[PDB]
Structures are given as structure tokens and as C-alpha cells.
Amino acid sequence: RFLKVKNWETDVVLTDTLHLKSTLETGCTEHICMGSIMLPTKDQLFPLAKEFLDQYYSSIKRFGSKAHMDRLEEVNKEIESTSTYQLKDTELIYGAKHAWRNASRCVGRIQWSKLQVFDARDCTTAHGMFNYICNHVKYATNKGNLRSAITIFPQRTDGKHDFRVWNSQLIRYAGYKQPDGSTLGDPANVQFTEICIQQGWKAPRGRFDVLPLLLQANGNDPELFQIPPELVLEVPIRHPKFDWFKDLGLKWYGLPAVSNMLLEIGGLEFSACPFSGWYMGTEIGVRDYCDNSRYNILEEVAKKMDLDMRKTSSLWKDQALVEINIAVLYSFQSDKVTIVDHHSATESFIKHMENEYRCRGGCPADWVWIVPPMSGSITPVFHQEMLNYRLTPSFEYQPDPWNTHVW
Amino acid sequence: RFLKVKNWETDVVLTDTLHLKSTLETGCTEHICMGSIMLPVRTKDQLFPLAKEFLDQYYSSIKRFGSKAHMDRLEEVNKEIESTSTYQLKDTELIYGAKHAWRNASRCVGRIQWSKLQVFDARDCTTAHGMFNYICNHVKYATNKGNLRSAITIFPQRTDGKHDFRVWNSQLIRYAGYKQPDGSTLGDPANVQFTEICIQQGWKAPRGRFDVLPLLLQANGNDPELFQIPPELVLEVPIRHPKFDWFKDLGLKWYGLPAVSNMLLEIGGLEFSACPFSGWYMGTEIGVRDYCDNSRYNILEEVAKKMDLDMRKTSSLWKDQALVEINIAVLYSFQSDKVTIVDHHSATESFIKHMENEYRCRGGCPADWVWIVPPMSGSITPVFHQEMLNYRLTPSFEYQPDPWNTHVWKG
Numbered sequence A: 001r002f003l004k005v006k007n008w009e010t011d012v013v014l015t016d017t018l019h020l021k022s023t024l025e026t027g028c029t030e031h032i033c034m035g036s037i038m039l040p041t042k043d044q045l046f047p048l049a050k051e052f053l054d055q056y057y058s059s060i061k062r063f064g065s066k067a068h069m070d071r072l073e074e075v076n077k078e079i080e081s082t083s084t085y086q087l088k089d090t091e092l093i094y095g096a097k098h099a100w101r102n103a104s105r106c107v108g109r110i111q112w113s114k115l116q117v118f119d120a121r122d123c124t125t126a127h128g129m130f131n132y133i134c135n136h137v138k139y140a141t142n143k144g145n146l147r148s149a150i151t152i153f154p155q156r157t158d159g160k161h162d163f164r165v166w167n168s169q170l171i172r173y174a175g176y177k178q179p180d181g182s183t184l185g186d187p188a189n190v191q192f193t194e195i196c197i198q199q200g201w202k203a204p205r206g207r208f209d210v211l212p213l214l215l216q217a218n219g220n221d222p223e224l225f226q227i228p229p230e231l232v233l234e235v236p237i238r239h240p241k242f243d244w245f246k247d248l249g250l251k252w253y254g255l256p257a258v259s260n261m262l263l264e265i266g267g268l269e270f271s272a273c274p275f276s277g278w279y280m281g282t283e284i285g286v287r288d289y290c291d292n293s294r295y296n297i298l299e300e301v302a303k304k305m306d307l308d309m310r311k312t313s314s315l316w317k318d319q320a321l322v323e324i325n326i327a328v329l330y331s332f333q334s335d336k337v338t339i340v341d342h343h344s345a346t347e348s349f350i351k352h353m354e355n356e357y358r359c360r361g362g363c364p365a366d367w368v369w370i371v372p373p374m375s376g377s378i379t380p381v382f383h384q385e386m387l388n389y390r391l392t393p394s395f396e397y398q399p400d401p402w403n404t405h406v407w
Numbered sequence B: 001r002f003l004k005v006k007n008w009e010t011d012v013v014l015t016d017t018l019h020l021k022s023t024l025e026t027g028c029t030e031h032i033c034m035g036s037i038m039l040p041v042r043t044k045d046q047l048f049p050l051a052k053e054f055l056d057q058y059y060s061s062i063k064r065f066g067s068k069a070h071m072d073r074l075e076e077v078n079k080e081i082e083s084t085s086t087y088q089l090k091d092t093e094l095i096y097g098a099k100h101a102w103r104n105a106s107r108c109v110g111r112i113q114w115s116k117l118q119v120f121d122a123r124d125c126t127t128a129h130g131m132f133n134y135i136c137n138h139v140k141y142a143t144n145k146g147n148l149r150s151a152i153t154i155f156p157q158r159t160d161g162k163h164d165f166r167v168w169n170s171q172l173i174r175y176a177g178y179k180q181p182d183g184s185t186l187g188d189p190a191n192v193q194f195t196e197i198c199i200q201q202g203w204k205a206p207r208g209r210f211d212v213l214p215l216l217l218q219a220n221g222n223d224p225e226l227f228q229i230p231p232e233l234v235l236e237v238p239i240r241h242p243k244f245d246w247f248k249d250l251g252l253k254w255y256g257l258p259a260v261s262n263m264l265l266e267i268g269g270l271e272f273s274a275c276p277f278s279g280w281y282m283g284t285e286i287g288v289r290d291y292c293d294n295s296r297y298n299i300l301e302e303v304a305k306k307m308d309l310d311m312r313k314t315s316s317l318w319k320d321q322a323l324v325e326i327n328i329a330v331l332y333s334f335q336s337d338k339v340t341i342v343d344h345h346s347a348t349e350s351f352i353k354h355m356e357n358e359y360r361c362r363g364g365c366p367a368d369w370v371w372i373v374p375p376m377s378g379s380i381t382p383v384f385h386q387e388m389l390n391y392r393l394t395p396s397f398e399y400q401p402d403p404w405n406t407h408v409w410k411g
């Protein structure tokens, strides 16, 4: 019932107790492990509320104080009456920060407590959403000195009146059908680019066209807005050694900002809660550039390096992959946009695991996502046993809204 | 019930029914996933069910389920168990058994090859000397002057747990490590403890960076005995680089035959605690793990110094760069000497093909992602994007505790 995790590199052994407060389910059973699958009202609300406020009041050293008991009654009175309730600012800040703290797939969690929270619960329209978002993007960007932040739109009610950002990130490039049978821009975004075009966007049809935000307020049809160009910090990609690199025409954006998830605090669901921090290099260099189903550029790069592409065993793919990632890091650093490499990121996450075992009794971690998609075994996370379990407050996936919302 | 797995690169969707024949337990629950934890006498009562299950499986595969010959064999095993408490496998069953343990190893990327496996039956073996002889022949047959052949040698099964056959070496061929009084290590730091025990048992250590350890063998529950593999049986490749001429002066070499000797093979409820098997390397097992783990040979600094990489900031990606050149070197060297080896691109691609055929023909393929995906270049290999189900079938290879931890010394 107490569980040991060992690090096979350093022999350090940790004891996890935090898992016993695990609440949600994993997908695994004693018969079958699903570790590698990408996705495995009135009655229920008060339990969820209570469990949250309990951890809250414990966290501020007020467990069992009168202020504690009073809030618990206040919230119960509100639910019995209004079939829902509202969070205090202090509660909301703590909930958001803890959803980040509990994100088992996030390597960057040493930072969890430095999160600027923007309370946008007073928002009512899609134009209001847009204003909030622009302010978030500008505050977060900070002329290259990136700062973590999240913006929280009003919470779900009867699920007939959801707030949703339709984009998956705030900033993403378009992807287009061609007669060629090929793909122009980012293939990740084809379908969404077409929901744009069909809702009205005039697509410039380039390789790196910044997508229009698509915002939905109080369950209404969504509306299109272009983030001001001057707010979208982008980075031209060059290599510190190869002068030809820049002729590939590569650029990436500086701000990673996931916008499609759902934040759950104390039973309440926040369906629009865009959040953002800063990139680990490999997310752009390995995934964005080199995945077959993305910009898929290895072939073009290797050629320019004049490597022997005759046999997989010359490791030309691997050689080209390292250079691309060297070019990503170098470009962001030279333009002074914040970025972290995988060595530094993982080394920080291991220090953060230790702190969290020391100070909280554990740290939920999904090894499959924490280990970088290149050079796994030379980073320390590789040798570290991890335990994966679901705690609340949390971020969760939710179905794409187009499939769902009635048009 | 049906479980679906998706490939995120190709959109290929597969259906597993095979997980429905799973018995042993994973270590995971509905509340905790242990998918990244490394290490998560049988009475008569359980033995016949286990025998029966195996024998039903065996008899299905040869298309004689329900035959008279199937019925009679269940009867005969039945009797042998009630009378002697154990039973003996036919050759045919043992071979089928050992092939399936491989086929069921979910941590093994090499399984496309599972049906081509040479089985050496060493169950007449009675002494340690006898064990030497069997193992030398395995190594010679498997080696084949560089054209590697997969093989397994199976020594007599567990009886009362007091008369166990064990190979104390974790692999038949591995290098000694020595811990120095200054605190540093010479040779392979991984084998320090085992090296210590061999010294204790009378081995005269050369004390080099690449001394082939002696075999240390336990027959019939007796104290283990030392033996040196004939050096002419031990194929080695010195490592050099196609473009970097200073690479050879690093002094690196490795052996050709990877041969796991510390696992326990389970078939029909019987336990074969000495069952060393061997195939051929994927390059990254040497070039990533053996050379570049901090806990192993750890040659990253020296390699990148010599390549003159900027080493003052991890963000130059100098480690990633040195790591690639070493791996190019390992593969170049094995190929030049004509010693069988597979690169990680080719190995994962074959695997995905095997995995698909297995779902089409067998209704599944248990697979552990943490292990299947290579420890360099993860996402440019097709397994990264592959969803996988992990569960346990028998026959199977299992871990067993190191024998110096359990052995009762006779003196």
C-alpha cells in the first residue's frame, strides 16, 4: 500500500503515499496495462466540493478552523439551492496551480507555483473572450521573457451554455488540402483550417499562416478573430554552423498555449481555460518538424548535409534530427525568446520529483510522456521509475466541440 | 470483449482479443499504473491446471485439439503428477514451449524471429562441468563465425527448489568491472559485484578494461564452479568510425553474442531456472546503453572532446551529437567484420510488421512500450507512435533473484 520508486542510475529509492488519495481511474487493470494509450449534477457535486475545500484549508494550515467549517456550510447551502457554486479567488488560484501540479504528463512542473491566473469568470461574449486572450498572449509573451499564465472563462452550467476555445493552441499554423495530393503547412490542423474557411476566414494559403482564434461564449455559435500580428512573437530558424539552414524557410512561434482542455476544480468544470508557459526544444525540433504527419523535414535536411541516405544504418535520420534541434535552440536563444533543452528540463523534473516526495509524499508521472522523444536514455528521467495516477484538481481532455455543439 | 489500439502516424487501428487468455498479473490497478516499474515447489493442486492449459494450447497449434493423442497425453501427465508430483515435457512440447515464451516476451523488439529458434535440450545434464560443455557448444553454434543464429539451451527443471540448476552470470559473455580504492571503476561498472564473487571463488583477474568474465555454474543445487570460455569461442569486434580516424584509439571493443543467462523459463507450470538464450544485437544496446550510460562505460565526455564540440552548455546538444557518432561507429564496425547486427530503424520497422501480422493471425501481441521504443531517437522510429497492450501470456520468461542472494552454501 506504500510504494517504492527506484532510480536505476543513482540507486535513490522514494516512497509514494500520495497515490492513496488517488481519485480518478487509469485505464489499467491487474490483467492489462494501458500505460501507452493516448486516451484510455446535484448528488456528486458536494462530495467533490468538500474534498477540494478540505485540501485547500489544510494547505493554508486552517484544517478544522471555524473559517473552514463556515465555507463548507456556505458551499453546501449554495448547491442545495442553486445546483452549483462559485469559488473564491484564493480557491481558484490554488485550484489552477494544483491542476498544473497534478499534470502527470508535464515535465515542466518545477515551476507549478509561478502561474499567473487570469480570472475571466465575468466574461459574457466572444468579443470579451478575444480581449482576455490578447491580454494573456501579451502578458505571457513579455517581449520574449516568457511567463506562465492561464485564463479561466466561466464554468459549465447545464452544458448547454459552455465556453469553448475551438483552437487546440492559441497560436498554430494552417494546413491545406492540395490537388498535388500533398500537404501545405501543418498537416495537424487541416480539418480545423477547413472549419475556419467554412465559418468565413480568408486563408492566405501559405506555409506558416497563423490561424484565427475561434471563440464560443455561453453556448453560442463561435466567431473568428485574428490575434494582432504584433502580438504573435515568431522565430526564424537558423543553424550556428550551416549557413544554408535559413534557406529552408523555417519559423516557429514562441508561445505554447494549450487551449482545448478542461480544468476541473472541486467538482466544477472550466471548459475554456487556455494556458501557456514556454517550449522545451524537442517539442519543435523533434515533433513539429520531424514527425511524418507534421512538417516531416528530415529528408530535405539530410540531403543538404550530403549524408549517405542509401541505408538506414548510416543513421542519417538521427544525424539530421540532432542538427534540426540544435538549430531550434540556437535560434530562440539568439532572439532571446525563452526555451529549455531536454537535458536541463529533465534534470529539473528529477529535482522536482525529489522535492514532491519530500514535501508532499509523491508525484504522479507518466514515464511515456516525460522521457524526451530523442536521446531518452542520456537524460535522467529515463532511469527513474515513475508511478502514474490521477489526482484532482486536474486538466482533462474533452471532445472537440465541432463534433458536439449543435450548430 | 475487444480492445482497440491506434497508430497515430498511420491511423491504422487494431483489435486485440488475445488479452482474454491472460493469467499472470501486471502490477497495475484501476488506480495506479506501474507500467514503468522495472521489477513489479509448486503444489500438485495448481500444477495440473497449468499443464492442461499448456497442453490444450500445444494441441490446438498442431491442429489436433480433442484428438485421442491429446486426450491420452492429458491422462498421462495427470498420472505422472499424482504419482511423482511433477512431469516431463516431450521434446516437441519443450521446443514449442521455448518458442512461445519468446513470442510472448512483451519487452522484446526482436520477435519477428520468434519461430526460428534453435533449441538445445540439456535436461540429461547433471554436473557443472557438463553445463560448461553444453554452453560452449551453444556459443559456438550461435556465433557461427559472425553469421549469428538464435538459440536456447535448457537445463533440468526445478524440483523441490533445493536442487536448482543456475548460471550465475547475467549474460554468458560480459566484461569484468573492478572498483578501485580511489573510488573509480575499471571495466564495466555493472558487473562489479559479480566480478567480486568470481575473484572470491578463485578467478585470477587480468584487471583490464575488457576481461571476459568466467562462467560460474550451479548444477543440481550444488555450490557453483568456475570455468573460462575458450577465448577462441569469444567473437569480438573492435570499434572504429568510418570518418573519424581517432575513434579506434579510444580502445573500445565489444563482444558479438548477447546471451541472457539469468531468466527463468516457464512452460506448463514447470520452472527451468537455467535457460540461457541468445540472438544478435540491436546497435543501440551497445552504443547507447553499454557505452553511454553514466553507470556503464560512460564515454560521452571523451568522445565529444575529440569531436571538438562546444561542451560549456548542455544546449549545444553535444551529448546528443557524440551519442550519434558512437552508434554510427558500433554499426559500421559490426558490418565491416560481418558480425550480425540490426540498427534501431530497421528493428522497429520489422517489429511493427510482426506486431500487425500477430494481431491478424493470433488476435494480439503483448508489447511493453517503455521497453520497445529505443533509447535514442525515440520519435523518428515507428513504434513511438504505436499504441500497445501489455499483458502476460505463458509460456514465459521471468525474472528470478540473483542466486548469491538465495543459495544455501554447502562448502
Ligand code: HEM
Binding pocket: A100, A103, A105, A106, A107, A108, A109, A111, A115, A148, A149, A150, A275, A276, A277, A278, A279, A280, A283, A340, A345, A369, A395
Ligand atoms: C514552463 C514551461 C513548461 C514546460 C517546459 C512544459 C513542458 C511540457 C511538455 C514537453 C509536455 C509534453 C508536450 C507534448 O509532447 O505534447 C507537457 C504537457 C503538459 N503540460 Fe506542461 N510545460 C510547461 C508549462 C505548463 C503550464 C503553465 C501548464 C498548465 C498550467 C502545463 C500543463 C501541462 C499539461 C496538462 C500537459 C499534458 C496535456 C495532455 O495530457 O496532453 N505545463 N508539458
Ligand code: HEM
Binding pocket: B098, B101, B102, B105, B107, B108, B109, B110, B111, B113, B117, B150, B151, B152, B277, B278, B279, B280, B281, B282, B285, B342, B347, B371, B397
Ligand atoms: C534476434 C535478435 C534479438 C534482438 C535484436 C532482440 C532485441 C531485444 C532488445 C533490444 C531487448 C531489450 C534489451 C534492453 O533494452 O535492455 C530485448 C529484450 C528481451 N528479449 Fe530479445 N531480441 C532478440 C532475440 C531474443 C531471443 C532469442 C530471446 C529468447 C528466446 C529474446 C527474449 C527477450 C526477453 C525475455 C527480453 C526481456 C529482458 C528483460 O526483461 O530484462 N530475444 N530483446
Ligand SMILES: Cc1cc(N)nc(C[C@H]2CNC[C@H]2OCCCCCc2cccc(F)c2)c1
Binding pocket: A256, A257, A258, A275, A276, A277, A278, A279, A280, A283, A397
Ligand atoms: C503549456 C505547455 C508548455 C509546453 N512547453 N508545452 C506544452 C504542450 C503543447 C506544445 N506542443 C503540443 C502541446 O501539447 C498538447 C498535447 C495534446 C495532443 C493530444 C491530442 C489532443 C486532442 C486531439 C488529439 F488528436 C490529440 C504545453
Ligand SMILES: Cc1cc(N)nc(C[C@H]2CNC[C@H]2OCCCCCc2cccc(F)c2)c1
Binding pocket: B110, B170, B258, B259, B260, B262, B277, B278, B279, B280, B281, B282, B285
Ligand atoms: C537474446 C537477446 C538479444 C538481444 N539483442 N538483446 C537481449 C537483451 C540483453 C542485451 N543487453 C542487455 C540484456 O537485457 C537485459 C538487461 C538487464 C540489465 C542488466 C542486469 C540484468 C539482471 C541482473 C543484473 F545484475 C543486471 C537479449
Ligand SMILES: C[C@H](O)[C@H](O)[C@H]1CNc2nc(N)[nH]c(=O)c2N1
Binding pocket: A008, A382, A383, A384, A385, A386, B036, B037, B038, B370, B371, B372
Ligand atoms: C525505470 C525504467 O522503466 C527503466 O529505466 C527502463 C526504461 N526502458 C528500458 N528499455 C530497455 N529496452 N531496456 C532498459 O533497461 C530499460 N530501462
Ligand SMILES: C[C@H](O)[C@H](O)[C@H]1CNc2nc(N)[nH]c(=O)c2N1
Binding pocket: A035, A036, A037, A038, A368, A369, A370, B008, B384, B385, B386, B387, B388
Ligand atoms: C502511442 C504513444 O502513447 C504516443 O506516441 C505518445 C508517446 N509519448 C508521447 N510523449 C509526448 N511528450 N507527447 C506525445 O504526443 C507522445 N505520444
Ligand SMILES: [Zn+2]
Binding pocket: A028, A029, A032, A033, A034, A035, B028, B032, B033, B034, B035
Ligand atoms: Zn498500467
